Amino acid sequence: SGFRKMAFPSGKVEGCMVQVTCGTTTLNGLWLDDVVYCPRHVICTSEDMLNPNYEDLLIRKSNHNFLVQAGNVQLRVIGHSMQNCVLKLKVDTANPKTPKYKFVRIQPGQTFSVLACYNGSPSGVYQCAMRPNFTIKGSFLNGSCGSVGFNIDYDCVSFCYMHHMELPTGVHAGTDLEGNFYGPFVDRQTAQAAGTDTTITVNVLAWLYAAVINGDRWFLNRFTTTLNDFNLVAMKYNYEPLTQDHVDILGPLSAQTGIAVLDMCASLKELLQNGMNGRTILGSALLEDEFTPFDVVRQCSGVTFQ
Amino acid sequence: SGFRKMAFPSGKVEGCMVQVTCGTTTLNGLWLDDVVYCPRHVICTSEDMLNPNYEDLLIRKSNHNFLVQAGNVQLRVIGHSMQNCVLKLKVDTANPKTPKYKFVRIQPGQTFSVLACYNGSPSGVYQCAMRPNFTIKGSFLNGSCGSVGFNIDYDCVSFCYMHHMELPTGVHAGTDLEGNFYGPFVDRQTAQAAGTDTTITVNVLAWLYAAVINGDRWFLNRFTTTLNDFNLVAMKYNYEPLTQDHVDILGPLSAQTGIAVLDMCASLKELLQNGMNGRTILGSALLEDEFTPFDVVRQCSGVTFQ
């Protein structure tokens, strides 16, 4: 037993990381089949980033201006194109380590693993949630752009995130692998409002179920509630409103533990109104919202991949 | 910027995981060169585990009784031997994916990444600390035995942990890769006292330095203290005593932030005596002790591997 914030095994993604250099700028790229994907701001100088015209900047580049290094191996760049905020560099070699993969646009509240990379080399792996305001709270130093976020389904890697930006507030923003930003953000060094974030209620409930499964049950209370009454409480505490779809997704955890979803909502209501009194749940002194219901079920059933 | 509990990239270890079956029991093994390492209790039935005589049980086994599956590939077992609490199965094929590696016995308070595995297949990766009482607080379901913990130094994997047991208290115990348990534990299904645990003081201090580097500085106080005065406080709160060796290890973080180690100790003293007042540090409402000074420096300098 036990419950940890667990990332997917990263080996299938490690074999796809490359270094991309354009002029003075080096960041990470993702090499799948004969295409390398990277943030288009690889073509910007530091001064360009204040107000870049990406079309004009890209027109000054040719295939031979993009240096792509796969460890020590090398890709000859035979074409380049811009798709939204990503650059797509066609190379003359298909990546022999290309896993089965899909490109996915995830929903706010969903989780994924990030492989943090510098100079095309993997540094570490950790699990994130896409915040309701479409930021992520990551660990990204200079040179980490182009690092990717992903999920695994047995043998298939679904890439969902590519890192582009740290906002002046220190949170992180990026795109799907078609180059569309999550949220209102742009790839420009300017002030950008993220807007109010909220707590992922269905994830908190899933984690309460995980706590009960592992024997942490002190928070189980005496009360029940209604969907509308609980949502009145959710709004006061900046929690996402709970819908019937969320209730349905929690169904299997409800059935395993014998705790009706609305009873768990009343326990969560009491935790929100009264705090945790210096107690902990699964080793945390805060309510955790970075595990989806699917995450909890997977960890409490031992699903494997490759 | 930002600070996350980050695991090492797991790909080099993924390529070493195999399934080991003996009779009814299947768990994980680690395939390096022409040797597969696994917990010796792979030879036990459920009833054996109550009081096993491993020497007598192993005498009833021959090479062909050990089924080792590397995905779909297979190792012919050509020899077997017991080294302390691990079984060493000699196979006729060297693992073509064997990384550069060492076997290391780590110290309490040190950290490592665990690749949780079932049936020889990787499930997830997370970062752990070896508690002062030589347990780890992991996520290990049935069938996870033989999963390993490791660190990476550029291209070299130092294996430090192999999972053997969940104690009746729900914490986890295991061996180094020579089969020697960390702590007083034995591979028998019986009640086993772990003994009092303590908080890893030098790790908490490292994480306070990481917090300051990332802009969380509200806890920085007005006071200083002495090593002996702080240790008086450490003992009251079940913290490990801080030594000069620990002070020396924190030297580089002290120098980067301009905060003398003893000043940070006085900030930690105030946090211990007054709590956190409903504030958070690096997103946590508890004092975190699972980052070593080396961990903090690595994450705030972007060291990479392969």
Domains detected in chain B: 1-14+100-197 (2.40.10.10), 15-99 (2.40.10.10), 198-301 (1.10.1840.10)
Are B176 and B105 within 8 A, CB to CB? yes
Q: At what angle do helices A261-274 and A227-236 cross, to 10 degrees?
A: 30
Q: Rounded to whole angstroms, how far apart are CA atoms A112 and A133?
A: 16
Closest residue to B166, CB basis, from A1, A4, A5: A1
Are B13 and B148 within 8 A, CB to CB? yes
Which residue among A41, A80, A172, A246 is the active-site one? A41
| DSSP structure class, residue B291 | -
Query: Do strands A73-75 and B66-70 pair parallel, antiparallel, or not at all (unpaired)?
Result: unpaired
Residues B39, A153, A261: CA angle, nearest 5 degrees: 95
A172 among known catalytic residues? no
Which residue among B16, B22, B38, B41 is the active-site one? B41
Query: Residues near B300 by Cβ (< 8 Å), separated by ≥ 6?
Result: A141, B3, B210, B213
| DSSP structure class, residue B41 | G
| B248 φ/ψ angles, rounded to the nearest 5 degrees | -65, -40
Closest residue to A125, CB basis, from B9, B119, B138: B9
Q: Rounded to whole angstroms, how far apart are CA atoms A298 and A302?
A: 6
Q: Provide the H-helix boundaries in chain B.
A: 11-14, 54-59, 201-213, 227-236, 244-249, 251-257, 261-274, 293-299
**Whether A8 and B116 lie within 8 Å, measured CB to CB:** no
| B18 φ/ψ angles, rounded to the nearest 5 degrees | -135, 170
Q: Rounded to whole angstroms, how far apart are CA atoms B38 and B22?
A: 11
Give CA separation, A208 vs A211, A214, A291, B163, in Å: 5, 10, 10, 27
Report how many Cβ contacts below 8 Å link chain A to chain B: 157
**Whether A303 and B123 lie within 8 Å, measured CB to CB:** yes
Q: Rounded to whole angstroms, how far apart are CA atoms A160 and A157?
A: 9
Q: Rounded to whole angstroms, how far apart are CA atoms A198 and A207?
A: 17
Q: Rounded to whole angstroms, how far apart are CA atoms B179 and B175?
A: 5
**Whether B7 and A126 lie within 8 Å, measured CB to CB:** yes
Query: Residues near A55 by Cβ (< 8 Å), separated by ≥ 6?
Result: A82
**Whether A124 and B6 lie within 8 Å, measured CB to CB:** yes
B144 interaction partners in chain A (CB closer than 8 Å): 302
Which residue among A38, A128, A145, A160 is the active-site one? A145
Closest residue to B2, CB basis, from A170, A300, A301: A170
Q: Which of B114, B123, B281 to mutate to test the interface with A (most CBs of A within 10 A)?
A: B123
**Whether A123 and B304 lie within 8 Å, measured CB to CB:** yes
Q: Rounded to whole angstroms, how far apart are CA atoms A298 and A179?
A: 30
Q: What is the least distance, in Å, from the CA of B137 to any CA of chain A?
A: 7
Are A36 and A18 within 8 A, CB to CB? yes
Helix (H, G, I), strand (E, B) or coil at B206: helix
Q: What is the largest CA-CA distance in chain A?
A: 69
Q: Rounded to whole angstroms, how far apart are CA atoms A245 and A243?
A: 5
Residues B294, B224, B215: CA angle, nearest 5 degrees: 50
User: Secondary structure of chain A in the HEC alphabet?
Assistant: CCCCCCECCCHHHHCCEEEEEECCEEEEEEEECCEEEEEHHHHCCCCHHHCCCHHHHHHCCCHHHEEEEECCEEECEEEEEEECCEEEEEECCCCCCCCEEEECCCCCCCEEEEEEEECCEEEEEEEEECCCCCCECCCCCCCCCCCEEEEEECCEEEEEEEEEEECCCCCEEEECCCCCECCCCCCCCCCCCCCCCCECHHHHHHHHHHHHHCCCCCCCCCCCCCHHHHHHHHHHCCECCCCHHHHHHCHHHHHHHCCCHHHHHHHHHHHHHHCCCCCCECCECCCCCCCCHHHHHHHCCCCCCC
Q: Rounded to whole angstroms, how far apart are CA atoms A24 and A225?
A: 59
> Token pair for residue B152?
């990476």
Give CA separation, B218 vs A11, B211, B213, B223, B277, in Å: 39, 10, 12, 14, 11
Cβ neighbour number for residue A242 with a 10 Å cutoff: 22
**Whether A306 and B138 lie within 8 Å, measured CB to CB:** no
Closest CA to B170 of B146, B147, B187, B194: B194
Helix (H, G, I), strand (E, B) or coil at B205: helix
Are B217 and B143 within 8 A, CB to CB? no
Are A30 and A146 within 8 A, CB to CB? yes
Q: At what angle do helices A261-274 and A201-213 cross, to 10 degrees?
A: 100
**Whether B7 and A2 lie within 8 Å, measured CB to CB:** no
Closest CA to A300 of A1, A58, A85, A68: A1
Cβ neighbour number for residue B143 with a 10 Å cutoff: 19
Q: Which residue has the tokens 């906002």?
A: A167
Are A305 and A154 within 8 A, CB to CB? yes
B85 among known catalytic residues? no
Give CA separation, A27 vs A16, A39, A163, in Å: 14, 8, 10
Calculated CA dihedral for residues A209, A211, A217, A219, nearest 10 degrees: -80
